[PDB]
Amino acid sequence: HGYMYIPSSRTRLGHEAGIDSCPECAILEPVSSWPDLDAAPVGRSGPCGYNARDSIDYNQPTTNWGSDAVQSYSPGEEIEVQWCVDHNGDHGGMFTYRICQDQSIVDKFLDPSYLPTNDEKQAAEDCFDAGLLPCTDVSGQECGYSADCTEGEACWRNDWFTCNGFEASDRPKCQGVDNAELNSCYTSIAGGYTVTKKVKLPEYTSNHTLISFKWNSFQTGQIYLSCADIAIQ
Ligand SMILES: *[C@@H]1O[C@H](CO)[C@@H](O)[C@H](O)[C@H]1NC(C)=O
Ligand SMILES: [Cu+2]
Ligand SMILES: [Zn+2]
Ligand SMILES: [Zn+2]
Ligand SMILES: [Zn+2]
Ligand SMILES: [Zn+2]
């Protein structure tokens, strides 16, 4: 149970708007999330998430999210990206952030009068994958391999970020990464912990595009997807 926190995602804004009672509850399941991180289709969840708790499809804007960029950044900027894990739903695993570079695909997620089809959602996922923001593109960031993977498996990749070992790495699981305090970010079930990294943006400008967050659970056959509206200017 988790969702993208900084820049503020559609899911964060939906909670803040009184629409989403459980932002951390937006789940793609059941899926094979491990060890082949990109295998499972995204179905209804798409790159922005679907929350079955209150039946919210974040892939299309509403009066409460998706109309405009929440934050503007510069081309090639190394930016802070943060997600929030609930105290009772820290499943370990690996996560990543992506920007789809095809504005024509992105634009299908920016129209309040249009709901993308499941095919469109998968096409977008494939574009996001081609635009993954590698951990190792940030100068000085340490990009480890997962304690829950072995060499050469499909999970053995440090473009993605990893949570700590589900034994610990001292500081087990996702919460161990920042080792932050409880309620450092909002979750509804048991209170949230931050999970904070940097990514390097691409070098083109756009007035309105999307970062999509994807977290592949280790403990469970679940994927957590969110997206944030951003500008690169
Ligand atoms: C954003 O849109 C405004 C108004 O059309 C334009 O002046 C500006 O150049 C655009 N920015 C981009 C394309 O990064
Ligand atoms: Cu969970
Ligand atoms: Zn609140
Ligand atoms: Zn993918
Ligand atoms: Zn694969
Ligand atoms: Zn190093």
Author numbering: 1 to 233
Task: Show me the paper's own sentences about this structure.
The AA13 family currently consists of more than 85 members exclusively found in ascomycete genomes and shows sequence features consistent with LPMO activity, such as two invariant but well-separated histidine residues and aromatic residues associated with a putative electron transfer pathway: Y224, W215, W83, F95 and F161 in Ao(AA13).
To provide structural insight into the AA13 fold, the AA13 gene was expressed from A. oryzae, which encodes a protein naturally devoid of a CBM. The structure of this domain (GI:317149073) was solved using the single-wavelength anomalous dispersion method. The refined 1.5 Å Cu-loaded structure of Ao(AA13) has the same overall topology as AA9, AA10 and AA11 LPMOs featuring a conserved central β-sandwich core (Supplementary Discussion). Copper coordination is provided by the terminal NH2 (Cu-N, 2.2 Å) and the π-N of the side chain of the N-terminal histidine (Cu-N, 1.9 Å), which is again observed to be τ-N methylated, similar to other fungal LPMOs expressed in filamentous hosts334. The endogenous coordination sphere is completed by the τ-N of a further histidine side chain (His91, Cu-N 2.0 Å) and a tyrosine (Tyr224, Cu-O 2.5 Å), both of which are invariant across the AA13 sequence family. The copper ion appears to be in the photoreduced copper(I) state, as previously reported for an AA10 member of Bacillus amyloliquefaciens and for an AA10 member of Enterococcus faecalis. The structural elements of the surface groove of Ao(AA13) are derived from the residues in the regions in the long loop preceding β2, the loop between β2 and β3, the long loop preceding β4 and the loop between β5 and β6.
